[PDB]
Design a protein around this nucleic acid. Sequence first.
RNA 1: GCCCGAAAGGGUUGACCCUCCCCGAAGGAAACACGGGCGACCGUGGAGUACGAGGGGAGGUGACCGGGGUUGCACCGUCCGUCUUGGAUCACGGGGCAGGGAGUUCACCCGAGCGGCGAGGUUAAGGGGGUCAACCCCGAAGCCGCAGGGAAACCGACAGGUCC
RNA 2: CGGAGUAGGGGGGCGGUGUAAGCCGUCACCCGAGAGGGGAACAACCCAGACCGGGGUUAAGGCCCCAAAGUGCCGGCUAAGUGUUACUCCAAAGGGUGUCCCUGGCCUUAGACAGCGGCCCGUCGAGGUCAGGGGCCCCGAAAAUGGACGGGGCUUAAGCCGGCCGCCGAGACCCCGGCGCACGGACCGAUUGGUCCGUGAUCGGGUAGGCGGGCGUGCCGAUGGGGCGGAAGCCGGGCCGUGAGGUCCGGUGGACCCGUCGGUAUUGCGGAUCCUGCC
RNA 3: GGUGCCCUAAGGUCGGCUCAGGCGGGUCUCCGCCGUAGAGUGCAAGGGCAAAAGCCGGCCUGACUGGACCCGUAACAGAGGCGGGUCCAGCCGCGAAAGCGUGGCCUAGCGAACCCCUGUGCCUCCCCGGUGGGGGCCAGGGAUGACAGAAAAGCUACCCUGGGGAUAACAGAGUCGUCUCGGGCGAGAGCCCAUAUCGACCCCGAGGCUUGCUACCUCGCUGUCGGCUCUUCCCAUCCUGGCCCUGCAGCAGGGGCCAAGGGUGGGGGUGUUCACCCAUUAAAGGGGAACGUGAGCUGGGUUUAGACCGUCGUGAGACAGGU
RNA 4: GGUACGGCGGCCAUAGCGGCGGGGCCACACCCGGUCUCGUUUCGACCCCGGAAGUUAAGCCCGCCAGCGUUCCCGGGUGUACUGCCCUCCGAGAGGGGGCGGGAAACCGGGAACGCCGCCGGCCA
Lengths: 154, 96
Amino acid sequence: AKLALIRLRSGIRARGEVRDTLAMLRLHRINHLVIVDDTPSYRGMIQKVKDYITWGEIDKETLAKLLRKRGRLIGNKPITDEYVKEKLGMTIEEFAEKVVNGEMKLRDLPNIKPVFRLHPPRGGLKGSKKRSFKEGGALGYRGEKINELIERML
Amino acid sequence: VKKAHSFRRKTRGKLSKHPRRRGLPPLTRFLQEFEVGQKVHIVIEPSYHKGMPDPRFHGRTGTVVGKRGDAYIVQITDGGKVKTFFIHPVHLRPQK
RNA sequence: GCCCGAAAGGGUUGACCCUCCCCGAAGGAAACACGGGCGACCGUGGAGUACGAGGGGAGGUGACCGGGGUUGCACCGUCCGUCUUGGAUCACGGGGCAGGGAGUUCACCCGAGCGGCGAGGUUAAGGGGGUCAACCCCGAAGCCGCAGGGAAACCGACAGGUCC
RNA sequence: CGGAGUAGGGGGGCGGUGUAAGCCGUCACCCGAGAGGGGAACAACCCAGACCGGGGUUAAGGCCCCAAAGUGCCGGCUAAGUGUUACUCCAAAGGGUGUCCCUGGCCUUAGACAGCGGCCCGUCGAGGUCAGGGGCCCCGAAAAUGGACGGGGCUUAAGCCGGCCGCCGAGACCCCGGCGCACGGACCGAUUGGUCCGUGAUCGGGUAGGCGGGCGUGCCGAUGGGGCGGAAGCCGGGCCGUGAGGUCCGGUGGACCCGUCGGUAUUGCGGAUCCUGCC
RNA sequence: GGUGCCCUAAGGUCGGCUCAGGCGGGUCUCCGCCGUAGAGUGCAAGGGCAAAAGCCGGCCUGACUGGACCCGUAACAGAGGCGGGUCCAGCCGCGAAAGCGUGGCCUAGCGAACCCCUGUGCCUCCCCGGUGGGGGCCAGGGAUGACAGAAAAGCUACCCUGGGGAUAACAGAGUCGUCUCGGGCGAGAGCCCAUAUCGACCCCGAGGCUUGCUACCUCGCUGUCGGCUCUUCCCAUCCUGGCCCUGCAGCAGGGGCCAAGGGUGGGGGUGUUCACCCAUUAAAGGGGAACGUGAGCUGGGUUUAGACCGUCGUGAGACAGGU
RNA sequence: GGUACGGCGGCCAUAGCGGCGGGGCCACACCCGGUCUCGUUUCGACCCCGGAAGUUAAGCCCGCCAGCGUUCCCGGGUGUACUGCCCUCCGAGAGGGGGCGGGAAACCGGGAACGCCGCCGGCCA
C-alpha cells in the first residue's frame, strides 16, 4: 500500500541523524507531503522520524484532488487533464486509482515533482504538536484519518 | 593518571577463554586455506601467541591480498587509513 | 495638526479626491430553510456565491501632490567602542568642533595570473651611436637547464617492450 | 598547490568525586557566531532558522479588565483568597468523625445511643457498627525600608480534576510581483567580460578568516572638453543611486577645472587615559 | 599495587612423568586411593598452560651474521628515538623424522646532537712520490630520572616596572557540614504516676545573626577593628498589659499562649567586641541595615619606612612572637 | 553379502560420572618368560624383545538406566525486571509515568537426551 507522510516539526533541537533521514525522504520544510511505498526499509526510516511527522494510508479520491490542486511540474506549472490524457492514455482519477494499487508509479508521468507543498490546516491542528495522535495530539501513525487532514490542508 | 596503550591493556575479557575450551583448538583451523579477495574475520585464540595482532582490531573484517610465509596479509579500514597485518590463520575465520 | 514651498521633481495635453464596469491568485462569509446534539455548536443547501492583492478600461471635478521643519496620539525600543563563556552594568575608554594619524622598503626562498624565446634561455659591469638621464646597436663573463648515484675514490641509464 | 584563523569555552542530558555549591570528563542539540514570536522581564526553556514590497492561513500558547480573542459547554471537587507557577525562582517526618468516594467483615423488625427498673422486657422502631485504602483541603509553618498570583481582583470562579466546542495569534507555510546568486546554453565583444533563455521543495542569518566586483582622493603619459556672458571652494535645497556617492537649481566667491583610456601613490578615521589649535 | 632487575641457566630442543590437598594404614621420609589443577611458573596484577608452557634427565649456545616489509608508543589524524611481529639468504643446534630455534609463555626493567673509546676493512690530506701522525664510512659502548636531554644557591618591610579579579585576605552572591532556634516516637527518672518537669538512643526540619567550602562580581571605586554621634526595622518577649497548666495554700517559683505601643541605664581593669566584677533597678533582651554610619569626627589596635628583646639562620635576614 | 571384529579420523559432555545384563574361531586385550635391540639414581612391576599352556574375570564389543553434570524444546514466571527515541506528564525533590519500538535471569511443571558422521580394511560365503 502507498503511504502519505506530512512533516510538522522543525529540526532545530533535533539530532543530526533525523535531519539526514528527513532530507533523504525529501521532507525539507514544514507542511510538505511525500508519497511512498510500504516496505520494511521505509518503515525503519518512519520509525526513526516518528516524532516529527504524521503518516497513513491514502485514498484514490484524495490523491486525485491532491494531484489536481497541489501537483506541480518542473517550473511549478500545474497539472492538467490535457497533459495527462496526452502523455498517458487516461485521466487523473484512473491515474490515481492505479498508483494507489500498483500498475503504475507517479514518476511514470514525466517532469512530475515528488513533493506536494501544502497549505496550513483550516481550523488548525486540533491537537498538540508534542503528543501522539492516539493519546490526544498530532503526531504518529494515523490511519485512514490522514485524508481528513490532507483535505483540510488542501 | 594517564596510561599509554600496550598489547595486553584491558584484555581481561577480550583475551580470556571460556573455561570449557582450555587447551588446544581443533586442528581444522591451523590448516585453513584462503584465497585473494576473500573476506575474513579477526578473532584471536589466546593460547597461541604467534602471529597475533593488536587486540585493538579484534572483531573487525578485512580482505586477504597475499601470503608471506605461513601467514596471510590482511587489509583493514581504520577511519580513512588502510592498515596491513601479517596474521596466522588460527586467528581468522571465513565469512559465511 | 500648524508652518515654508520660485528653480532644479510631477502636473491644466489635466493633481488630489469621487463614483462605474470587466478579469481576478492564495483564500473566503452571513441572513435564511431543513434536520442531529442535555448543550457550546455542528451537517446539507444557500455557495465556491458576496468579497478578495493587483491588472485594464470609461467617465465627472477642476489645483494641488510628492518633499521639508516642528509637534500630538497609539504601539515598539536599557547608548557607543573593547577584551571576555558572558556588557544597560556598581568593569575599562567616552566635554564639543576642525585639521593630522598606523602592513612600508631591500635582500634571499615557496607558489600563482599573464607574456617571450625554446634543448636552450638570459645578459651584468661596461663600450659605441644619437635630436644626449628617455632612444638604438654590440657585449654570454657568469647563473640556471640538458645524467644521476655515492662520505669519498670511482663507476656511468628505456628518443617506447606490454596492459587498463 | 596555496592562504588562514583556533591551544580560557559555556547551557542542557549522561558518568566519577564531593555535605552541597562546585571540580573533572563525555555526548554534539543549542549560545558563543542566531534575528523574529511567547515565558512579566530572562545568552543558551517552548515555537521557529532572516533578500524587498504586499495579501492570507497557522505554531507555541492564549481568550473577565490591563490586552487581540469565550464573563464558553457538560460532569464533579476546594472554603483554605488554598490556588490563580511547564521549567527557570516553589518546605518535611508526623498527624486530622474537615469533606467527597472504593472495599471487606459483623449486626438488623428491633438493631447502635436514652431513659424506667433489676443479661432482659417494653419504651422512641430504621438503618447501624468496625476496620483497611484513595482525592482535595487543614495543623506541623518564625525576619529584618513599604507589597507582590506580573497587577486589579476572582468563591455553583476569573481556582483544581476529567472531557468537549469555537475564535485570536509570527518574518513559520500558501500566493502575487521585484532584486541578486550558483549552474548550464546561445549570441556578442581591441583583454579579467556584456544581453538574453532555462533550472532552483533540495539558493538568500553570520564573529575569527578566506574569495569576487565597485565608489572616492592626489600626480604622470595620451585623448576629448569647459572657463571673467564667471573656475575651484562654502551655504541651503531637487533628482538619480541597495550603498560607497554622483549630478543639477539658487546664492556667495573672484581664476582655474573636469571626463574616458592606461600607470603610479606620505591614497579614505569616532576612539589610541592619541597630537595641535579653537571654543 | 608494582618496575629502574636477575639468569650459562631461569636460554634452544628431545624424551619420560604428573600437581596442592585430603582418606585409609605404619610412628613421630614408606604402600594404596579420591583428586579439572583448588599447585607451580625467576620477580606485581591480569591472562594463558596437564601425554603440558609444570618436575626429572641427555645433548647444545638461534642471547649469531647480511638485509627487506609491517604494527604500537602516537586510535580516528602528523614523528625523532625505543619496542614488537611476519620473512629472504648464510652458517649451526636438537631430533628417527616432521618440525622448532633471531634470548626469558604475553604485557615493565630505559636515553638525542656534538665529543671520546673499541672493532673491522677500505677511501682520502692543497705540484709529485714515500714515512710518521691526522680526517671519513660501517658496527658496538660511556648520559642526561625535570627520563623528546640547560653546566647553576638565597633576602627584600628601601624595593621598581609591566600586567592580572585567568588568583588569595576584605564585604557581596551560592551552599549549609558546622552554628543558633525547633519538632516526632516514647526508653527511663520522678513516694506510686511515660507526658507537672525532664525527655535519652534513633528519625524529620526552619533561618541565614557564627564558622567553613567554592571562586560567580570588583586588583588602584572604596581596602580596615573598636568607640562617639544620629535614624530606622524583625521577633525567636527581658520588664510593662492580658491569659492557660502545675509535683499552683499565701509570698513566690517553673513551663506555655496573645502581644513589638513604650522602655532596656551608670561605672572598674583591658585597644577591645564579647566575657568577668560593683552598686542600683520594673528590668537593666538578642539581632539587621555594605560585620548601618571616616565627601560625620576620632585614632587606642592592625599592615610600610626607625629602633629593642627572645627564638630560628654560616649570613643578608625572618617570626600569622612581644614592645 | 555377514560379522556381540579392527586402524586412521571429524564434530569435541545431547558424547561426561555412576549403575546394571550379556559375548568371545578370525581379531584387542589381560599372561610366561626374558640372553640379546632397551633399561630401570635400586626390581622384564613400567617400557622393548619371542610365543602362546589358560580364561574372559577386567579393558574392548552389544543392550539398557535419568541418581549427578551438560544441551535443546513446550507452558508458566511474564510481556515481569532493564532499555533506545519523544513529552508545556506526576512530584518539594529523590525519582517515577505515558506513547512508539526491542526484551531477560532465577525458579516451577512437563518432554527428549547414557553420542552422531566419514575413509580403509581383515576374516567367514
